[PDB]
Amino acid sequence: GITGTWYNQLGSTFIVTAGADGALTGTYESAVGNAESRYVLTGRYDSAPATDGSGTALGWTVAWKNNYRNAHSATTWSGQYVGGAEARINTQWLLTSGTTEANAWKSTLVGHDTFTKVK
Amino acid sequence: GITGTWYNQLGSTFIVTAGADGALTGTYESAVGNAESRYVLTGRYDSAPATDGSGTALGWTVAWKNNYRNAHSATTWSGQYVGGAEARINTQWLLTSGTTEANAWKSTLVGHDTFTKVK
Amino acid sequence: GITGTWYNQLGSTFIVTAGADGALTGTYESAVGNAESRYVLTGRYDSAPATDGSGTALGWTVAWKNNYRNAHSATTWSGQYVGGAEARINTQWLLTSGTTEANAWKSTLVGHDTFTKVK
Amino acid sequence: GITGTWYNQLGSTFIVTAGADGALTGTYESAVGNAESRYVLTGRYDSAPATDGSGTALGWTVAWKNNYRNAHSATTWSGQYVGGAEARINTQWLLTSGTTEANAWKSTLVGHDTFTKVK
């Protein structure tokens, strides 16, 4: 149930296709990256998770560049997919901007985003 | 100069191919994931960085599963490639394990890894 | 309104006294640290925040040791106090365990905790 | 050997006094906070670490306000003190700025700092 369309708490949409090889492909919109544009995502997930009741660990990367905009930054999400009655993806993320060496200390943002299948 | 073979401070090797579309593909070995096995990585990087002297922001994901082992975890690196005389990739990373809901608070590790082209 | 008794999403209680010098003192209970024991906290907050409508940035540290237990770890919370009708403290946290040098890569946990004044 | 004067990789000085109660008090200078000013720190450390050879887990908070400046931000460091021939404090840190609710996603920076006793 990991393949589908997901929404976070802020309004981003996360359309993803999980493959049997463990690949993870799709698109991302709708800020923290930028206001109104689609961005390519790619990532991985473990395709045979534990059956003791557990999250399916996954992660994906969006580089914030398309034909319209370039923010010179990349966000990687790292979390686990929690199956059940309401499907849930709880992630931590890191957003790194391309900086000079004197500005390398303030290059990385950190936050968290939870994803649901309903909005 | 982002395509090539990289080594971190602990002994991991990071063989990567950057594509013109912004894609990022390769393999990863040699602990924090697991001891001696190859793992598929995928990620993204911005393919037209700023020319004011700046890092090329990038990120990639490894799910720690191959034909030999499965740790039920995924690591995402987020950093910038710093070009120059000695090439350098300075990253922060998040390692998320698949846990139960009662253990969801301790599911995510955080650290940092710097990558050089010589070892 | 930062002085008082706070509760997170998991059941921890956070009794804190803010001082006019910017000091921050109190006690902490009730897991991620350990099950049922009180722990000394200390931290700081900016005592003259911006009046444009903004969070009051704060942070505090708990070392998980009292007369009963010692987990050999410390958690630091970093967040902002958001005033209003419902008072709110939204934090990110880092929990570092004392490890050997070979285990230094997995020494730091990361998560997030939001605190309210009602439970 | 945790009491003393420490220096990071960027030039910050970290003068600290550890107490027998587990308290941690001192001053901080010299950027990531701000250019040239002293700031009060407070924090905690476990006062009876493991004797199997291990770091002493510690953490401290600096709110970036004194009589001269106010950045409306706070940094918390979380790490372990590694004793030996060369004393070492390896930390991760979180820097949270006071933001509006619409800017709450980009409020927290993350990085790392290693501290030595010689500069």
PDB file of C-alpha atoms in Angstrom, chain C residues 3-95:
ATOM      1  CA  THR C   3       6.938  29.095  32.980  1.00  0.00           C
ATOM      2  CA  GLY C   4       4.706  26.188  33.935  1.00  0.00           C
ATOM      3  CA  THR C   5       4.052  22.487  33.444  1.00  0.00           C
ATOM      4  CA  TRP C   6       4.132  21.027  29.940  1.00  0.00           C
ATOM      5  CA  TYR C   7       3.211  17.672  28.424  1.00  0.00           C
ATOM      6  CA  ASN C   8       4.358  16.131  25.166  1.00  0.00           C
ATOM      7  CA  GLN C   9       2.579  13.811  22.734  1.00  0.00           C
ATOM      8  CA  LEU C  10       3.912  10.684  24.474  1.00  0.00           C
ATOM      9  CA  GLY C  11       3.245  11.482  28.123  1.00  0.00           C
ATOM     10  CA  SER C  12       6.384  13.195  29.415  1.00  0.00           C
ATOM     11  CA  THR C  13       5.892  16.037  31.871  1.00  0.00           C
ATOM     12  CA  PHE C  14       8.109  19.116  31.636  1.00  0.00           C
ATOM     13  CA  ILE C  15       7.943  21.394  34.688  1.00  0.00           C
ATOM     14  CA  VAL C  16       9.993  24.499  33.985  1.00  0.00           C
ATOM     15  CA  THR C  17      10.781  27.873  35.539  1.00  0.00           C
ATOM     16  CA  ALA C  18      11.978  30.614  33.224  1.00  0.00           C
ATOM     17  CA  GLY C  19      14.017  33.388  34.794  1.00  0.00           C
ATOM     18  CA  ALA C  20      14.498  37.007  33.822  1.00  0.00           C
ATOM     19  CA  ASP C  21      18.197  36.432  33.129  1.00  0.00           C
ATOM     20  CA  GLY C  22      17.288  33.957  30.397  1.00  0.00           C
ATOM     21  CA  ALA C  23      17.844  30.909  32.557  1.00  0.00           C
ATOM     22  CA  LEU C  24      15.611  27.865  32.408  1.00  0.00           C
ATOM     23  CA  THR C  25      15.382  25.341  35.252  1.00  0.00           C
ATOM     24  CA  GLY C  26      13.150  22.431  36.172  1.00  0.00           C
ATOM     25  CA  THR C  27      12.509  18.687  36.056  1.00  0.00           C
ATOM     26  CA  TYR C  28      11.646  16.017  33.474  1.00  0.00           C
ATOM     27  CA  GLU C  29      10.013  12.571  33.811  1.00  0.00           C
ATOM     28  CA  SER C  30       8.285   9.857  31.957  1.00  0.00           C
ATOM     29  CA  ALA C  31      10.088   8.057  29.083  1.00  0.00           C
ATOM     30  CA  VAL C  32      12.200   8.679  26.197  1.00  0.00           C
ATOM     31  CA  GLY C  33      14.775   9.141  28.943  1.00  0.00           C
ATOM     32  CA  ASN C  34      13.589   6.442  31.400  1.00  0.00           C
ATOM     33  CA  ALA C  35      10.301   5.063  32.714  1.00  0.00           C
ATOM     34  CA  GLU C  36       9.475   6.621  36.110  1.00  0.00           C
ATOM     35  CA  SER C  37      12.041   9.024  37.576  1.00  0.00           C
ATOM     36  CA  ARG C  38      12.667  12.790  37.789  1.00  0.00           C
ATOM     37  CA  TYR C  39      15.681  14.354  36.042  1.00  0.00           C
ATOM     38  CA  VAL C  40      17.195  17.818  36.381  1.00  0.00           C
ATOM     39  CA  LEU C  41      16.972  20.051  33.333  1.00  0.00           C
ATOM     40  CA  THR C  42      18.731  23.290  32.594  1.00  0.00           C
ATOM     41  CA  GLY C  43      18.695  25.461  29.532  1.00  0.00           C
ATOM     42  CA  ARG C  44      18.318  28.921  28.097  1.00  0.00           C
ATOM     43  CA  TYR C  45      15.795  31.028  26.211  1.00  0.00           C
ATOM     44  CA  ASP C  46      15.948  34.509  24.770  1.00  0.00           C
ATOM     45  CA  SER C  47      14.280  36.797  27.268  1.00  0.00           C
ATOM     46  CA  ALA C  48      13.342  39.547  24.778  1.00  0.00           C
ATOM     47  CA  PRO C  49      11.869  37.919  21.654  1.00  0.00           C
ATOM     48  CA  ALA C  50      10.675  39.746  18.558  1.00  0.00           C
ATOM     49  CA  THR C  51       7.227  41.320  18.736  1.00  0.00           C
ATOM     50  CA  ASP C  52       6.326  40.786  15.053  1.00  0.00           C
ATOM     51  CA  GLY C  53       4.577  37.570  16.001  1.00  0.00           C
ATOM     52  CA  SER C  54       7.181  34.836  16.331  1.00  0.00           C
ATOM     53  CA  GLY C  55       8.268  31.961  18.516  1.00  0.00           C
ATOM     54  CA  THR C  56      10.496  32.471  21.526  1.00  0.00           C
ATOM     55  CA  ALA C  57      13.547  30.349  20.730  1.00  0.00           C
ATOM     56  CA  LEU C  58      14.653  28.128  23.592  1.00  0.00           C
ATOM     57  CA  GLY C  59      16.619  25.018  24.384  1.00  0.00           C
ATOM     58  CA  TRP C  60      17.379  22.775  27.347  1.00  0.00           C
ATOM     59  CA  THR C  61      19.432  19.717  28.265  1.00  0.00           C
ATOM     60  CA  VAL C  62      18.633  16.660  30.368  1.00  0.00           C
ATOM     61  CA  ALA C  63      21.419  14.293  31.360  1.00  0.00           C
ATOM     62  CA  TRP C  64      19.707  11.004  32.192  1.00  0.00           C
ATOM     63  CA  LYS C  65      21.138  10.455  35.660  1.00  0.00           C
ATOM     64  CA  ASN C  66      19.633  10.844  39.114  1.00  0.00           C
ATOM     65  CA  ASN C  67      20.017   8.978  42.406  1.00  0.00           C
ATOM     66  CA  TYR C  68      18.088   6.003  40.980  1.00  0.00           C
ATOM     67  CA  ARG C  69      19.274   5.411  37.410  1.00  0.00           C
ATOM     68  CA  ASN C  70      22.037   6.302  34.969  1.00  0.00           C
ATOM     69  CA  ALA C  71      21.518   5.709  31.263  1.00  0.00           C
ATOM     70  CA  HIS C  72      24.847   7.420  30.347  1.00  0.00           C
ATOM     71  CA  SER C  73      23.068   9.634  27.845  1.00  0.00           C
ATOM     72  CA  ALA C  74      21.928  13.205  27.398  1.00  0.00           C
ATOM     73  CA  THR C  75      19.063  14.734  25.434  1.00  0.00           C
ATOM     74  CA  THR C  76      19.013  18.341  24.261  1.00  0.00           C
ATOM     75  CA  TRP C  77      15.785  19.868  22.980  1.00  0.00           C
ATOM     76  CA  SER C  78      15.890  22.807  20.590  1.00  0.00           C
ATOM     77  CA  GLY C  79      12.716  24.650  19.636  1.00  0.00           C
ATOM     78  CA  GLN C  80      10.521  27.707  19.955  1.00  0.00           C
ATOM     79  CA  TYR C  81       7.714  28.593  22.356  1.00  0.00           C
ATOM     80  CA  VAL C  82       4.628  29.699  20.429  1.00  0.00           C
ATOM     81  CA  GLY C  83       2.322  31.893  22.479  1.00  0.00           C
ATOM     82  CA  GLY C  84      -1.376  32.307  21.868  1.00  0.00           C
ATOM     83  CA  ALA C  85      -4.694  30.857  22.944  1.00  0.00           C
ATOM     84  CA  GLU C  86      -3.177  27.385  23.247  1.00  0.00           C
ATOM     85  CA  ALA C  87       0.449  27.611  24.325  1.00  0.00           C
ATOM     86  CA  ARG C  88       2.839  25.419  22.380  1.00  0.00           C
ATOM     87  CA  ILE C  89       6.507  24.384  22.421  1.00  0.00           C
ATOM     88  CA  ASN C  90       7.621  22.655  19.207  1.00  0.00           C
ATOM     89  CA  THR C  91      11.070  21.084  19.523  1.00  0.00           C
ATOM     90  CA  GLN C  92      13.607  18.974  17.730  1.00  0.00           C
ATOM     91  CA  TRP C  93      15.832  16.887  19.959  1.00  0.00           C
ATOM     92  CA  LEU C  94      19.135  15.021  19.922  1.00  0.00           C
ATOM     93  CA  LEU C  95      19.828  12.121  22.281  1.00  0.00           C
TER      94      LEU C  95
END
